[PDB]
Ligand binder design. Structure first.
Ligand SMILES: O=P(O)(O)OC[C@H]1O[C@@H](O[C@H]2[C@H](O)[C@@H](O)[C@H](O)O[C@@H]2CO)[C@H](O)[C@@H](O)[C@@H]1O
Ligand SMILES: O=P(O)(O)OC[C@H]1O[C@@H](O[C@H]2[C@H](O)[C@@H](O)[C@H](O)O[C@@H]2CO)[C@H](O)[C@@H](O)[C@@H]1O
Lengths: 474, 474
């Protein structure tokens, strides 16, 4: 017997400010690092950027009406820091807060629970110029001031808050792979910026307990659970290292306020461990979250990697299947194709059982409730005559993942909700507009901006029925 | 660059009372459950039992002299409860305490650290008769009385203490497989007795903090780290279940005082979860150990097991290689031979890297120091003319495991010591005398006690050199 989804289950969908809003220079908004980064040639797919995105800043009423038609119980969005503090610090921009006030009111007036995400990668460029943004401890108080501003203005109406969305992605991509701003390839700087982000996460959670005492808050982690390739002891050891280096390194800090020791010792041997100040451990250990946010898309299978072995591999940002290659850390592990699952056209593994596994691992290690803040299928969609988008492939992916959530709940995992990525089509930061995730098709591609009109996909009606039956009919 | 073994690393060897002592009915000793069980027809290999064993009770001076010749830093032995309390909970048998006093004095006069193990499976039969031994809460205070008796008598001379040795074995074999006393095959009773054993462990650790404030104490867990067979999601999920049900089920309670939730829910769903009394969780959570004791011999590889699938399999107690078959829990997991490691003639996997993995897992999950309380190769030995025993196979096994301990220490695992099983040959409870583990061969077999003479094997001199070089020459 499978348990039902709890009556309070938050059936959601999600977006991110830079990928959805547009209005990049309106109403006093400052430049974010992504405004500046995406305009540099070669940084994004076909030069696509968020100047207009899908224009949700001007069309939020239409989009929320579509959410209400679908019956969404929750909508997770991120607030653009540079709309609220165009400088990062300094004077608050009332016009920026007013947009999110109007958005939250539109959501509440349609019975949709807002889930406010504080940070999705868009620190104001002014803070990068002033002091290197996440590489300086000055960002802890500046981020805290920004968060407290939002807590005071919206805490009366927003129960659920996410602090840093995918810190492991914006840190690793920004400082190890050089694919996100600041475009750095320096592991020492990566772990320093990462430690400061950990302190910022902890500081704002502490502030949240003061300003929103009955709210619920947590970071959201981009979780690819690791698998060993097989039972060869060296491959299981590679899995132990991969899970600790890629996943425990973040979630142990979020849950326990401690870095895992083997990873710490390895980094220390390379001279890469972060600088620790007196009080750091105390602050990190005291900032217990109400839930672990989880962005899940795929598992990763790993195998042994000799000391002279694989480092950085090829990443698929074109949609040409089979173009990704193995990446790893010499001496510890490297990725390998999992022969037992299929992949998307961007070589992302399709592994719904892996979501049950990841939920089980988090509950087993940390005993935390989980809010699934992102999950979805990025794929090409075709607009057929009659405003028909037959995205059965997206329905299939979503169905199987939701089925596995129900099994994890039956296993005893406390899952608060499920936010599909994404509500409407939106900009993929590095993959352009053709890698679509929405329930709602948006009419543009990478060449032609067209009119951005909204068209309900077949998956829209499928998820409408999911919510209508509280997940009993998948 | 491997880090050295720490200077005071406890190079040890180990035994257990019923398996080594003999003198089963001397000097006032009462019956243990193993005295009675092993004399039931069909319960042990060739009807072997511990009436005489290798007669360490009378020959302990000779054996300790051999330990001193080897240069052992530590000797781990177990105290026979039925020598100290012949009826389990009445008046103390001073002759019983006096034997362990003489033993401890002999060890300390030769510079060997005693490591006292309170319980290696030999609860007095009188407590089984009176109330069913571990199945009754009465055993908590009776075990506590016995433990405090030893703490008061020996706490001045014994720093390192082990509480329950392989609770997961004596409980699961006693109550699920029916292969140990009391011969029960009932999962509900198994988890009830297990819960009471957990409370007994917690109670005596609490007592230890009062009576031996400067000592170190921990339980010892029979740890077979689980591997998934491959990266098929269903097999990784089976590994998640196997690791939780077989390993976290015990070690989470020892380290955190809490059972893992997914396993608890499954047992609850079958009406198998233990009865919990007011105060149980507070006691279990309060009894933090100084170390996790680890008895390691092999890893276990698992795969998906359907609801109609494999239950109990064939267990090899004969030394005829290849006679074991898969065991598991229908719906959760089943074992499968690991094609990437060799096995002994008793079908135990030889996986030294698995020891590094297991040590890494305990440090990663619990941040506890580890005392390796047992590790060894059980194999046939041949006595060659001139009293020579060339057990290069045992040297190879021990060398490779000690090498992996050093890698684990380099990774940052705090390993306090390493006790090889066993110092002399001794009785295997279910496999007789031919499944030998000793550094010291004992001249007897399953048919005759012969003269019980002690003969140093080649591995004796190998380990002597290991100790002399503090593990720098393996
Ligand atoms: O738009 P994408 O690249 O297809 O990503 C989908 C959403 O997932 C998050 O980012 C990805 C990241 O880009 C990957 O490189 C990494 O491997 O995993 C995370 C998935 O957690 C972002 O939350 C979002 O902006 C993406 O749209
Ligand atoms: O004498 P054995 O059966 O060869 O075992 C040697 C030592 O290992 C522990 O028992 C085994 C147990 O008998 C196995 O059936 C089980 O699978 O695992 C443990 C291994 O930890 C005994 O507790 C140990 O003290 C034996 O003397």
């Amino acid at each position: 017997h499978l348990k039902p989804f709890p009556p309070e289950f938050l059936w959601g969908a999600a977006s991110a400010a830079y990928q959805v809003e547009g209005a990049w220079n309106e109403d006093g908004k400052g430049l974010s690092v992504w405004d500046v980064f995406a305009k540099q040639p070669g940084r994004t797919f076909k030069g696509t950027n968020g100047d207009v995105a899908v224009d949700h800043y001007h069309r939020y009423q239409e989009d929320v009406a579509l959410m209400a038609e679908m019956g969404l119980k929750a909508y997770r969005f991120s607030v653009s820091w540079s709309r609220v503090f165009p400088d990062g610090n300094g004077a608050v921009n009332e016009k920026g807060l007013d947009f999110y006030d109007r958005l939250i009111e539109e959501l509440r007036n349609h019975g949709i629970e807002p889930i406010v995400t504080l940070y999705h990668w868009d620190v104001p460029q002014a803070l990068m110029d002033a002091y290197g943004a996440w590489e300086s401890r000055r960002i802890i108080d500046d981020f805290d001031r920004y968060a407290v501003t939002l807590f005071q203005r919206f805490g009366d109406r927003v129960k659920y808050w996410v602090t840093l969305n995918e810190q492991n992605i914006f840190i690793s991509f920004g400082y190890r792979l050089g694919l996100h701003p600041p475009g750095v390839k320096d592991m020492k700087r990566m772990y320093e910026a990462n430690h400061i982000a950990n302190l910022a996460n902890a500081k704002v959670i502490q502030s949240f307990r003061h300003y929103v005492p009955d709210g619920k808050i947590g970071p959201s982690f981009a979780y690819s659970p690791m698998y060993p390739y097989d039972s060869r002891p060296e491959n299981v050891l590679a899995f132990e290292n991969a899970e600790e280096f890629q996943n425990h390194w973040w979630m142990d800090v979020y849950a326990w306020g401690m870095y895992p020791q083997a990873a710490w010792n390895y980094l220390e041997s390379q001279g890469l461990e972060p600088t620790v100040a007196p009080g750091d451990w105390e602050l990190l250990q005291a900032a217990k979250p109400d839930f672990m946010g989880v962005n899940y898309y795929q598992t990763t299978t790993v195998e042994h990697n000799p000391p002279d072995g694989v480092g950085e591999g090829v990443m698929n940002t074109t949609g040409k299947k089979g173009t990704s290659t193995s990446s790893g850390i010499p001496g510890l592990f490297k990725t390998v194709r999992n022969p037992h699952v299929d992949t998307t056209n961007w070589d992302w593994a399709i592994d719904p059982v892996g979501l049950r596994i990841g939920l089980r691992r988090i509950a087993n290690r940390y005993q935390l409730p989980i809010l699934i803040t992102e999950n979805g299928l990025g794929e090409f969609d075709t607009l057929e005559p009659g405003d028909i988008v037959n995205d059965d492939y997206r329905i299939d992916y979503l169905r199987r993942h939701v089925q596995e959530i129900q099994r994890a709940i039956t296993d005893g995992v406390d899952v608060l909700g499920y936010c599909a990525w994404s509500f409407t089509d939106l900009l993929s930061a590095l993959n352009g507009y053709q890698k679509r995730y929405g329930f709602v098709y948006v009419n543009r591609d990478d060449e032609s901006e067209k009119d951005l009109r909204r068209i309900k996909k077949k998956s829209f009606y499928w998820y409408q029925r999911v919510i209508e039956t509280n997940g009993a009919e998948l």
